[PDB]
Symmetry: D2
Subunit: 426 residues, 4 copies
Amino acid sequence: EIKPATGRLGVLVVGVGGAVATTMIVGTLASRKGLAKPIGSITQLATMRMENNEEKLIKDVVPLTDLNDIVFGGWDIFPDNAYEAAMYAEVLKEKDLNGVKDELEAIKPMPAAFDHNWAKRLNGTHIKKAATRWEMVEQLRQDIRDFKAANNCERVVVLWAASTEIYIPLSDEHMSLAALEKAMKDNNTEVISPSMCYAYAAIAEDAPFVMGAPNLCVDTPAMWEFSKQKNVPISGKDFKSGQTLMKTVLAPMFKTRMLGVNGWFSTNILGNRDGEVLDDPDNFKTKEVSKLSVIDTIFEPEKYPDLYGDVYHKVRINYYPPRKDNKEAWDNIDIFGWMGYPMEIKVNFLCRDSILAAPIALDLVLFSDLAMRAGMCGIQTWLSFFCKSPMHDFEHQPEHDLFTQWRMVKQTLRNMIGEKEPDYLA
Amino acid sequence: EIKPATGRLGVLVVGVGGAVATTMIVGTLASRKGLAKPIGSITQLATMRMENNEEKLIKDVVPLTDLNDIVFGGWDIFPDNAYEAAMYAEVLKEKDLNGVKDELEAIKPMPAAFDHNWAKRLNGTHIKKAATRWEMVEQLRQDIRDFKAANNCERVVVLWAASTEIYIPLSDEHMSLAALEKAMKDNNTEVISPSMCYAYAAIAEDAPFVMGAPNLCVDTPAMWEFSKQKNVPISGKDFKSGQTLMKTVLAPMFKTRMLGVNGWFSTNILGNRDGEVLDDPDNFKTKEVSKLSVIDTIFEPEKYPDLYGDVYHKVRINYYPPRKDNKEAWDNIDIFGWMGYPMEIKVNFLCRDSILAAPIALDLVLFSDLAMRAGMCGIQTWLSFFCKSPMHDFEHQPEHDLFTQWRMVKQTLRNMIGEKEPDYLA
Amino acid sequence: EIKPATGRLGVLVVGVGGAVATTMIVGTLASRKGLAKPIGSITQLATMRMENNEEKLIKDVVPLTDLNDIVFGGWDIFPDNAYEAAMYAEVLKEKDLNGVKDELEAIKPMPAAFDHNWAKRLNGTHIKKAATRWEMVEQLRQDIRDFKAANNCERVVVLWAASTEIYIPLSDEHMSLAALEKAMKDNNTEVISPSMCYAYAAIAEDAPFVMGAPNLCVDTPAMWEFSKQKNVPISGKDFKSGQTLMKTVLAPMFKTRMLGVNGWFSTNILGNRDGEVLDDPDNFKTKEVSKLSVIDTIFEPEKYPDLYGDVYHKVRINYYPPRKDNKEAWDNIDIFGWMGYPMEIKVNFLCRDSILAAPIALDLVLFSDLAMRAGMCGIQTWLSFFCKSPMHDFEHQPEHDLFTQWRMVKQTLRNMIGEKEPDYLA
Amino acid sequence: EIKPATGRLGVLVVGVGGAVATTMIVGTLASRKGLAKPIGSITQLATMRMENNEEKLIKDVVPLTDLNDIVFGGWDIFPDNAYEAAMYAEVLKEKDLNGVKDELEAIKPMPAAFDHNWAKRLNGTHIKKAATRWEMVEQLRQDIRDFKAANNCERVVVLWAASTEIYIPLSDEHMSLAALEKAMKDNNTEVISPSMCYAYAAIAEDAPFVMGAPNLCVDTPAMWEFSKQKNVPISGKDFKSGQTLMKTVLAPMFKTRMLGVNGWFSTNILGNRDGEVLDDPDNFKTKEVSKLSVIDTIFEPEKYPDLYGDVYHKVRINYYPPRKDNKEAWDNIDIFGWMGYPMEIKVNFLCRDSILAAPIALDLVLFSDLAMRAGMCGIQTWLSFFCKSPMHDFEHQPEHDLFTQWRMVKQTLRNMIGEKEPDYLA
Ligand SMILES: NC(=O)c1ccc[n+]([C@@H]2O[C@H](COP(=O)([O-])OP(=O)(O)OC[C@H]3O[C@@H](n4cnc5c(N)ncnc54)[C@H](O)[C@@H]3O)[C@@H](O)[C@H]2O)c1
Ligand SMILES: NC(=O)c1ccc[n+]([C@@H]2O[C@H](COP(=O)([O-])OP(=O)(O)OC[C@H]3O[C@@H](n4cnc5c(N)ncnc54)[C@H](O)[C@@H]3O)[C@@H](O)[C@H]2O)c1
Ligand SMILES: NC(=O)c1ccc[n+]([C@@H]2O[C@H](COP(=O)([O-])OP(=O)(O)OC[C@H]3O[C@@H](n4cnc5c(N)ncnc54)[C@H](O)[C@@H]3O)[C@@H](O)[C@H]2O)c1
Ligand SMILES: NC(=O)c1ccc[n+]([C@@H]2O[C@H](COP(=O)([O-])OP(=O)(O)OC[C@H]3O[C@@H](n4cnc5c(N)ncnc54)[C@H](O)[C@@H]3O)[C@@H](O)[C@H]2O)c1
Ligand code: NA
């Protein structure tokens, strides 16, 4: 039984002043007015073959929030409105911003729960004054309540589209809800991320949460416990948009064709606010761990020792101001075929990072809202498709193969309406 | 009921002295003696999840001919034995050839049914003297019969691994078996390819036929009629090994992610005997048509006009002696995402052409032998996976998506033993 | 004695409505008004060390026409004014065109001497009606005279910046001025190019002529004879802007480091009006011959047989609408070092063709005007630097090495003012 | 007055067991026997135009040591002979090693002056037991004396071809010979490199010294003082073989064509013993500083602020075992032309590092020997051509432009025999 998508959906974005957030916002406002097309959006454009073999838009098969019913808001450490912030990001042409300037200028960031130590390269001013991690939680819950009431929203989704936080490991404080709350109250600044405070607030307020950065946040037993108790879906993490998208397509190719891999080198140059943050090696590490993780379970080295027994995998990210938002990736893959003979594949992907990630953020938001109305909660395995590091508990492995991930999306969608695929190939 | 793989399989290769043929041969002889591994071979290495969820090697699920039971022979316009021909091709190191030298030297090409006009840049003289296309057929049937008897083969498969022939269109003479035979007898050398003579002979002699080049041959109503009458499988065409393999992996990626494509340019440089032939524009055309054909049914431009309504697709092949057998591909793909913003992907694939195609030729041969023992005949749709231009009749469309093609392979294999997939994801 | 640059210079451009012509025009108008910088212009920006070791701008060492004293006009088969033509070409942003719109709109093409057969893929109709090649000459001389009088120009230069014409060989009619005139009068439309009619008219009217395309035109004994009789400079041919620029830089590198070259493959993709024309193989050939010619005299294979005795050199140009004016080049160079061991260099040059060629066209024009005021005539060897196929008579070889070519420019400039280089390194 | 090259030259290599050293050795032994060609060697293959315009081999213009008169030896921390070490390095085919195996096996490394702290990733055993830096000096002088006597060498050259040492800055101890000696005696392990001990020993023993790594060593006032006092030439540093060679060719191209540069990103992957050492960031730094230094003096940002006022330059080196000795470089250069419009150049250079550097090491050795016999001493500015970081005192700037560097080589060679260039272009 799926609750219908009635009334307005508040989409509250952490980092609402960021490149990805503003691009998603501009694209949504323009798309719903017929001034642009939501290219790259599964929710808006993709179709599926149904049990009776009819081909339908996914949006016509399950009840999603209509773009016209979305109201955007959120938090940032810079006070600039969505228009000012989009002008700064330099992703979109002025004529695209101008077409929705009226609406953009009216989207204003609330002050952020921020800790300088977690993103050292940023120096914004628009930050809450907040006694403890737990005070951050309480202020954020207030903001959600205020926003819902002021904008007449039936439901909310909270999307983290803010900066990559410093690397931190799993620890004792993350192992249960009680321990996490205690650490929040003691103001444990080392194990409690700002992001965890927004996630807690979101779940406490019946709002699905999406982690679009590679941050340790909802991938902890404490959050699995809380989200399940509250009947809230959590999804993550790290939008899979460009270089990693490609990696989770070519690795399946080598696997499907039983070709061996000796090595895979991946590098990137980018010069945006994302890149500025990632220039701190501590923040780099968080991205690196995520990027590195996507091939092992595809190859399965223990099962195919003669193909993948010895893959040397290395990823690098380089701050490079000339590229701005347009991350450029270069990959070199050393493979081998018949009789062990080696070959090389070079890929140069000239991305527009925020262009690629904008529809992915929209899709995660709209599918998260659907998941809750469909009675789903805890880790949304079915949304692995959208993410570099698909969240999983200690009894499950992440699935990384894009094509298998897409099948998982379709399977859950069909299941939601009590249907099966019309045949194996669909 | 699948007939068991007893006794010896004769594998008769048209172009047995060629780069792909000798590479497949060397690798098979070495593999079966434990001097090399058949990397790239689905038949030898790939596994599948079965109905009860056990994972097994395909070769342990269906009865295939054991490598030890294969005997190689075939035809070429050059008289060199398989050792001399492998040394000429320069694909494999001498240390690899040396390990199986005695067996290679014993593989000697029978004189070919050849027409200089169909492959003008070749000037070998190990050719039959044959008054008519029909006499070519009869001599080829004799050779098959002689080989089976001399080598004590229970069954035969004929693999065309010879040069790409000049472009010719579908014509009246191809539209029924009666018309094709008539044209053979009248010696119509403009509509009857040499390859059609080998295909006819193979089918007439109860031998599955595989077209590993892009030649018009078994993709005609005449051959669909004949193969059905004789209960023989036919498969083709054009081994999908390198640049085109990649095309049928990336195009599914763009499709799965709802990314638009404005254009796709593919070029390559190669300096082998394959390249010598393809330097004739007439022979180039045959390859070009095949390479061009692989994206339309993936994109479906009529269904997604806003993504793929206007793809400019161009392929080039350039003779380049320095590369030898190591074809080098360069591709530039112009794509667009959210709100129509353009991006570019450049792919540089340093192929070893014959290394990539060798396991594909082996797999087509072994699966063709299985298909016949399993009572299958006519167009082997299930082997689309191995081919750039999957054969199809006028009531079916080719499927090009590698991942879907792999599912087609598994589905037929499961069906052969009366099983279903354990679940949608398997 | 160099005649001073007084009064106005008429710069009459064949193909004044083309991508390169309009880009040069816009940039000159904007530069002189301080709305842009003439990046890439030797005349505007380059310096030289003088005999007394002072470093000066070239424009301060020899008397050039000031940008403010240039008046543009010319011919095209499309009647669009320079503004409309610049908007069509899509090289420059509207904000750049807007700054000089009034001046651009006032530049209007005179009807062209055109022969459809020489550029078949173009179908403009702003063409003269002219019974014979000779009548073309006379009408073009009239246009030059009219323009000089109407715009109060002291001097004129004629720049061919129009489409690459079909390949034609040197022939009897080109071997003397008398024979060329005879062929013009007999209306021999097979050996007399339209471009030859513009060149004749320019020379007849005391106007230096620059061939910016690879056309057979002023590289004939007839034009060497005429330009000498009239004391007019002629320069050419084919602006060296992008891929070929790089070729004449890397080949000197391999030479200077005594590295061998086995092969060099050059391809590109472009979708502009240039590309439309070059899609005709006959027009392609003209470009191809020019691009192929630039390495032999650098390598000197007869002198260094062990390095360059066997270079396989191949160039391709591919029409590709998605690229528009932004030609994209890909090169693969196979080199070898110590003990013959091979290595590879891949170059991907994302050009803006008209951006690269614009300053080159301006420099050729301004240096040609200087050359005549300095009493120079016939083949301007010293301007080889700007050209893919430096013009030369039957007793001289072209010099292709960019760095040597630059030295040739400086040497002539120094000589013009009776100076020597201060030292060998300057 | 040039002393003739009589008798045998001892070429003593620090790191005689290394990839570059063994490649140079094998190539020299094979070349002098006509079993291979010394491709890449200026000394062996390059010609020059002389004052009377005759073109001659440099080796026929100045007296160099004949390859037949070279005797190789040196030091390493691994005791393996030159044959064993070359087999380990995997640069050269076995058939090339086999052809000179007899001579190679007879080249045995003397125990090294080594300090683990300066190259932490190496753990060889074949190291001297040496009380102090000064004891290292005295033992090394003994080794040189012993070698000269045992092999009947008239002259010696010492070539450092050993591992890149950790970064260290210039300091007080380097500022005079007296201070350097004092620091050596006090065993100042922090400011005195092992390399400095070999350099001191070489100069003390009348042997020119070449620094083929980027190490601080002879680029100190102390060594300038000593080398001048002893009348010994010193040259360095860091062979310029591959990616940096290219950088000092393309930067001159942009300069010569007045094109602006916004950025230049350079990365590398390599998996050899060199790469193992450079995996330590301290050792990386030494290479990085050297690689970064080569463009500033080419561009001259203060002179051309509108072209080069703001170049973002970044270099990376990545350990990557699959590449072995075959370093692979990728560069992205952001340039701009006319009216400020941006363009991009991508270079992928698949090097064989030791193949490229072997002739450079030979040339520096043979030219160093010539320099001394020609009465030259101190910093050999004229050998800048061969080096990434041309050594210079505090009153001189390095020249990096390859083409200018080549002219400097020719100028010194001509000067040595009292000749001038025949003309400016030669
Ligand atoms: N762009 C892509 O293709 C892509 C792909 C993978 C993941 N991501 C991740 O998405 C996130 C956003 O990307 P972006 O390019 O928009 O970066 P951005 O820096 O432009 O946007 C992030 C915004 O979050 C703000 N912010 C940081 N910490 C905050 C806090 N505690 N509370 C509120 N606001 C905060 C920043 O001030 C900034 O405005 C990053 O983590 C990035 O790595 C993006
Ligand atoms: N190599 C690959 O990766 C690849 C990819 C696509 C398809 N193919 C196709 O496979 C075929 C074989 O490729 P290859 O590289 O081994 O080429 P090859 O030139 O080495 O071909 C094999 C042989 O075919 C022989 N031959 C030609 N016409 C014949 C005839 N009528 N009868 C008998 N023998 C004949 C030739 O003499 C040659 O020795 C070609 O058509 C090629 O285009 C190969
Ligand atoms: N763009 C570059 O970087 C580059 C490099 C090499 C050389 N070139 C050559 O420069 C020329 C101009 O290049 P473009 O990109 O501006 O091309 P374009 O097609 O935009 O050319 C300019 C114009 O020439 C006109 N034209 C053709 N024939 C004519 C005739 N007989 N009389 C008068 N006008 C005529 C066409 O109508 C067109 O508008 C081409 O031949 C091109 O190959 C340009
Ligand atoms: N390969 C190239 O193209 C290239 C280019 C630039 C510079 N270089 C530099 O040249 C040097 C040698 O390069 P390689 O590839 O042969 O590396 P390598 O590691 O193969 O060779 C260096 C050798 O020196 C030895 N060694 C180290 N410290 C020593 C000491 N104190 N005394 C004696 N032996 C010592 C090592 O054990 C090793 O055998 C490195 O500094 C490298 O960075 C080489
Ligand atoms: Na890197």
